[model samples]
Target chain A: SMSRFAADPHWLIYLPPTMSPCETSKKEGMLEHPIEAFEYFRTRGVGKVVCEQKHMGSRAVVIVCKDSQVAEKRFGVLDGTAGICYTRTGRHFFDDMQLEAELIDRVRKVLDKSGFWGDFNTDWVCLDCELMPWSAKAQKLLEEQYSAVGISGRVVLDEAVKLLKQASLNNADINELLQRFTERSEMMQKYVEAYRKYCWPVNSIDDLKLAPFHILATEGKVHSDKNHIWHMDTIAKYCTQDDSLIMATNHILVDVTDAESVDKGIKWWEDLTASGGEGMVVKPYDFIVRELLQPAVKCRGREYLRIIYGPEYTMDENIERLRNRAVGKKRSLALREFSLGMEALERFVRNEPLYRVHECVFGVLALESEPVDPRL
Target chain B: SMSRFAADPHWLIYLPPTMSPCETSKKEGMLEHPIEAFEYFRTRGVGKVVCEQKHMGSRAVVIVCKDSQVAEKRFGVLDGTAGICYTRTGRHFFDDMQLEAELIDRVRKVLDKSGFWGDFNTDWVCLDCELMPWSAKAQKLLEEQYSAVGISGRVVLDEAVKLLKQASLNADINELLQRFTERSEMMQKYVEAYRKYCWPVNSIDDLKLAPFHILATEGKVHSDKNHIWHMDTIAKYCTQDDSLIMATNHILVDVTDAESVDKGIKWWEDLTASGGEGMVVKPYDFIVKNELLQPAVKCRGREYLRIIYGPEYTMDENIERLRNRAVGKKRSLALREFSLGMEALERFVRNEPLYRVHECVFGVLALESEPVDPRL
Candidate 1:
């Protein structure tokens, strides 16, 4: 039974380390005809201007790992998560770390919020990312605070840098990419030069501009257990690909680096709010150069707990109210206190500074007058 | 004879220059007030603007100069004469010095050329001009011109000034003027103040904004005796007003000012070719600071001038050629030339330059040789 699980198909080809077909051809061409096209153009009197066409389509990657035969797909994986977990074997040093599903689900929720679904048909989007564990201290802290509520994925410090480079250069849509590749050589020689100037190394998969679109795990997955089937459409509906998400991951990673303790507490509160759970906070490793304290926070306490009601519609209303208060006009000290009354008290206790103020926990309540009566 | 022309015997005084008994009673507060009851607001938030109404039958002022009047009803003594004139005498000075019937003929000819005859039902049009010769060069010129045209009208230089003063100060339109009348105490006070302002006076008759429309002219007894009555109708038919003439005048006067010289010339030539012979050139007069020139020099050149012909019915072919040029990317240049050559030339010159030139001179003949044959 262990070998059956262990013998996962090695889909190492889906990883950024694997070479694409065009990359292989280009590598082969340099070995054969190095100066042919260049010599032909030197004799022409007219120089040419180049034009580029924007191509729109889905992005995909196929990885094959040599270490294991078993294969698993993770959708919309962050670039920072590469090498921490293997697609072929689902192999990782920390076996209990199952944050991959949480991260993917979070991304799916965001995409669905923006109505960017129906873009990709795939059920799971597997992006190449590094998944590394926080230091022992940070891990312990996260386990204590967020153990009940799961996180999705993390970055392996070393491999993530290489994968990020590849993601930057990746072009989605193979057909359009190939047509553009040929078109650049035919009509627009200057653009071809520009492409060459900034193009990534093709032979190394880690240097490829990896696919930006993929599905999340929250969408339903297909499984066979020698019995009847169980379907969860949430996972199935999570798959998507768009330029915004691909770019957002990069921004989020940068944001995590400089996050203050207060920022971390706020992020934890928001995460708890979004996940429909009681509030909790996680801190990064103190030993690992608190430099990367944001995503790698290894310490935290869950003080000043808040409760959430199940009407679900109240969550949106609460979020809208907070946003409105944050942007209200003509705010005075009295008005500010009135707006921040309960939330400020909770935030103050969560942010490391111990406060003696009594904790105020507010439960989401559906307004009775709302037409739909969301409680139903 | 005077009795024959005396205020139409059956006409009622209340119908002309007077309102009905009921209207007069309603406007009892002010003398001659009913006629001023027609009020219109010139603008929003402004008080009512009032003007008088002339409720009257057609009244003609036949001013037969002492020299031109042969008899009260038999005043047909002047014909084919250069200095015989008649003027109109009334509230406004309609003076014509040596104003002969032929001058009216000239004005009628201009109207005829403009095609405004049918709309004018009256036998004569009242001319309002001051016939004065003083330090003013224009006044002297007017006298000379009128004498040359054999036109006559009353000469009221001094009385005109007093009437103008009364109208300006008292805001009265019904004020009448006669020779050698002393002013009343109120009128003297107003006149003294106006004189302090030292307003130089022009005949009030010339102040009305003239609308270009139908014009009327009369036939004198002397002129009628010379021309056969049967032939008169035939000649009049050829000169009758029509839309074409009206449209031509409307286009030339109202719409043609901004057009180029070439266009104006082309239009003039075309109209002349089309039997519109009257032409007047009013050069911009700057010395006296008048923006518009009046009594501009008039011209009706000799007949027997040949008409030119161009490649007619070639619009489609020309347009096709233009299309060819446009396709060849010379469209902008060709179009600019076409507008300048066609519409602009017609507007300013009243005819196309090339068309007129061709009409005035012998043209190139295009002929094809064929075998000579005897008549069938």
Candidate 2:
């Protein structure tokens, strides 16, 4: 069968596992709340977790072999490619190969100057990262899906509001209708603003930013055995070396047993959303835990849900319906894929045959093909 | 995209590398000969080689985990499957999952009794083997491609011979008529030869696995070991029990010595002249001395190649044309795939993550997609 992607498949080794959202919230006017995420870990006996800012961008797995020789010898790459940046489903992250090459070269230089190779004691590295801004990859989604809705809503609502105002002036009892239309107009504005926060023009590679969170693997080790804090700290060092191109993921450690810490996390999510941030992902301190719990659960912001569910999703009626959103299947799928991904990476570091590693990678891809709610 | 096969990717740890035919023979009436195989090795400064009987069956890679628990913990298979037997292209060997499970159980029992797990100190083992009879997996090819051609050629040639006989009685066309009569008889024999290899497989007892290579175990890959070590070690286990296990027939040779080389050729001739397919000549060492040289090349008997190239392939003009077939591309592809396969297996044995192993496995699959002569 033909591959779904045009990717070389050689460097398309690891695809990031899916992450499920936090359990539905019972809190008034909220379908997803940080309290649910906090409770999830607290009840599961997880003592500590890290809340990382969920960047509004596409997920990317970057494999950087030390050199072309290393790529040829290890990855069987005959082309002059030393690395690749691919999407979760193993598609090229960038349409232009030259653009991808430039981006990879920049990261390679930063990795070299940061002495990452020496520290890792390996000739190559695989990174779990986010490439921003969202518009970089989701341009079509922004223009056709979000922008079309916003433009139509604004144009239609403005006309409706004007006609309602005219009716009120003509002595028709249209006050309630006018008020409802006014509220909808304001909600539509907020919806447009919510999605607009993530869109930005990209003129060159320098304008792009790569926020790496996990040092997934090297020569003989899958870093999942390392805790989340270790991954964050190590990746932060690379960001410091190239502050302009590489971004240090913003994150905070939390004690799930402490009520104060839970409240603080909730407040952080509220403030982040109030200022146009998309959301945050809360993960246990350990990269992979023994229990069948989600490795990481996203707690999206209130306004952000507007772009997802629609402009009026924040309404009490809509919130009540959405609160019944089934998370069990999504959570289970996420955890299973997470385990497979870790296994795949671990097998790779152990130098197993390509087929063995592909077993896991392909498993994750196959799981992705399952009919899960995309929005979830 | 979804894979066409229903196999669990977890057990597809290795895909056998492709093997190319030996260089074309310059000798009259010979498209391939043992002399070229030895010469190819001798020119590369290789001294010893092994000529192994080529089984007329589908290539299968068998991964037998120690037990169900090992299968679950390591391969994530929880369906009571202890291991998997997959085809060369990574599809399940049997359409009946139950039959496959039964076959795996029988093999596992033999391995347990033979102390393979204890001897290797591995919870699982990956074996490169040939699963027979050829009709088991190739019934469709035999019926539609090979049998149809043979049947049609015999029927039409017989009718033409009868027509020619009648004409020859009244004309001076004895030579041409005799040639047609002989060709018709040869075509009939060709059809009968192909029919001899296929038989109904009513149960697991009817199936046979001729394992020639013990690819990898817990902590090591056996490629660096010599061919004799692999054959002898595996033969000891197969001979102890299980009629389903068939030991491969092989002969060792010193390429520099004319006597040894002649003996090897004679063995191949005896094998093929008795209705056997052919023999594969591999370097005595599992891995070739030079990376540029082929790991193994097949030198088929004159009659056996009729099934591959056609029944008329041995005619003087046809043999001359076939001798000019270009082997460079096939040879290069074989070496590249072999290197990748070894790297993948070595990586897996070293305990790398799934992605690392998959990088190589997926490379092999991608290369398999390349347009090439399927017969080669």
Candidate 3:
């Protein structure tokens, strides 16, 4: 029954467009701008932050032009052009077939709203997003990191769920929420119709649901009252942070400069998370204290950052403290004063810089093999 | 081409029967066998022994009974009772839509000669024989022994033609030999007709064929100098050996007695080639000599057995001369005794009806484990 409906309707599907092919080759040498990776925190004037639990789920970006089904068909065509629309194992329907069909119908509406009607066949109007109910993108990123190091998780999502249940999320409301979103839509609406048709009715939100929390900004520090609670905004911010780090990394790799690097970084993060990792962290060049929606100073950290490098450096207490500070405040961009090594990083910072901090902030992250001689 | 036979009127049709509850369980334990399984092997001899080649396919035992299609309408009275013949897998076949009609006829003829035909409304018969492409049994056995341990060989048969190519003798000789069987006149004719119907193709000889070889008087071994080699016989023997060892070890755990355990012990030896150290030694049962269908003994010293068990115990001076004398000679059964506890073995041998030689033989095997013990 599960397999039958899995392929019928196109589901919300997301595809990672960019990846660091160099990373898989066992390449060595740190990025020239590792300090820039944490610039967002310095601009926010955040310290001793709480790195909240990031949700691991499929991120679907759907655009339904006419109807969900028609939108899905159009999306399929676009994916075929992109060459990754099919399942990795090479099946036609990439997700739950029945659910995919329903998602196609849902996405079709979105495409129609976006005013991309009959012009859909031209490849510009495909409804697309990732469909991963059982498979989580963040989980995929962690798995990939583990696989690279040859230490595969015996279990990923299940283990995460178990750990989350055991964690001291004291007094926090635990609920699993499912919803569809468009990058263009500013409002959050409960997917009532989709829930009725697709999601099983639940007496409690926590039943079979994975929760996402929001980390709200406070005076000079990124602090959320929902410290142990699941909030969508917090989760979204975390996702953004992950995308930022990935974008920054790719920016260095592809020699891309300027804001366009953010898009590439997002794609890289998406791919890494889709494959399995903890997610990415990004430190924006500028910090926006007033605008919560601003993309700057948004970056993933803690376990997410540790995934790229080995876990030899990241400690739980420090990561949480940094995340708390990033979401809480605003400060001067002065992160360029401290340098490990890299002429390009120094030049880039001089041209467009963030806050500088004593090099002690990077002490925990320095590769274990590298001697901690601060003179360098 | 294989699919094209679906419409051919002359093509024999084969239908897999609705597996009964019992047959279903047998199918699941494709390779492993339980202790109770020995009775099934003894009754059906359902498995095959592989010759160096021939019938590289798996061996199966089929049983058939009268079912609906074969029921005689007596005075337009259709009897409801179906014949109840079954194979070890315990399934009965009929002219079910699942099985092709032509293949049924071919099987019926063969079953008629095998003397398993019974009366009932259902003329459905189960044919137990080797599947002629790749023997599932051989594949299962090799997978069990070699997959975990990582051994590779061309021992597996991939095609019926490959199996035929490896037959010990020509097919025509086997057909001629089948005529000598002292069976009922009708049965003999049936066997000949079945052979003709099967076509002048190479295949492992069915039971109706003459015995492939006679035991030489001097040694208890078979010779196929004059007639077609009994490929099926060898295949059945080898397959049975494998099945027996697998069955014994799965349930019995270990062998405490030396003589009575020869069947299982030697089966392990031939199938796995694992004779060494405390596991197994070759001096005792180096070669089973079957003379005139009876076994014989070829006496030899311990030096000869060292080749199969490894040459760790050889003396310095006469090692080369001993090796030259004992390269391939069958050793006497006197050395075959093995025990989990050497003390228990020595004590048992001392109490044996035959005294002097038993103690020496027991002491020799026991001493092999600890060659330079000062107490000895």
Which candidate leads the pack in TM-score?
Answer: 2
Q: lDDT by residue for model 1 over B1-376, one digit each (tens)?
A: 1111122211110110100111111221111111111110111111221111111111222221212232222223233222221211111122322222433344445445534334333223322121211223333433343232111101111122233345558122112111101111223333233312223223322121111111112321111121122123223422244211111131122122234334544444444433332243322210111221111222221110100101111123454454234332322222232233223222212323433422221111100011111000
Give per-residue CA lDDT, model 2, range A1-376, as digits (tens). Answer: 1112368767756778888787667764465888888888988999899999988777788888778899988777788799998878888777667778887878888888899889889888899998774433444544444434433333332233334335446622223333343345445445444433333335587657788888898888888778899989988886447557788888889888998988788877777665557899998999877578788999887656655654334334564555445477777788788888888888877878888888999899999988766557
Two-way TM-score contest, 1 vs 3, winner: 3
Q: After superposition, how far is residue B301 of candidate 3 from its true place, in Å?
A: 80
Which should have the higher lDDT, number 2 or number 3?
2
Which ten residues in a row are the worst by lDDT in model 2 chain B? B170-179
lDDT per residue as tens, model 1, A262-323: 35434444343333222221211111121211211111111111101111112234554443
What lDDT score belongs to each candidate, Candidate 1 first?
0.23, 0.72, 0.26
Q: Show how many residue pairs clash in every candidate, following the order shown.
A: 97, 33, 112
Candidate 3 per-residue lDDT over residues A1-376, each given as its tens digit: 1111222223222221111111111111111122333333434453212222223333222322333343334333342222222221113332343344444444333434444333323322221122333323323433333333221111111122333345536511211100111110111111211221223222221122222232222112222223222333323332324322111112212112335544455455444443333344232222223333222222332223323332222223464354334323221111221122122223222332222211322321232223321101
What's model 1's lDDT at B11?
12
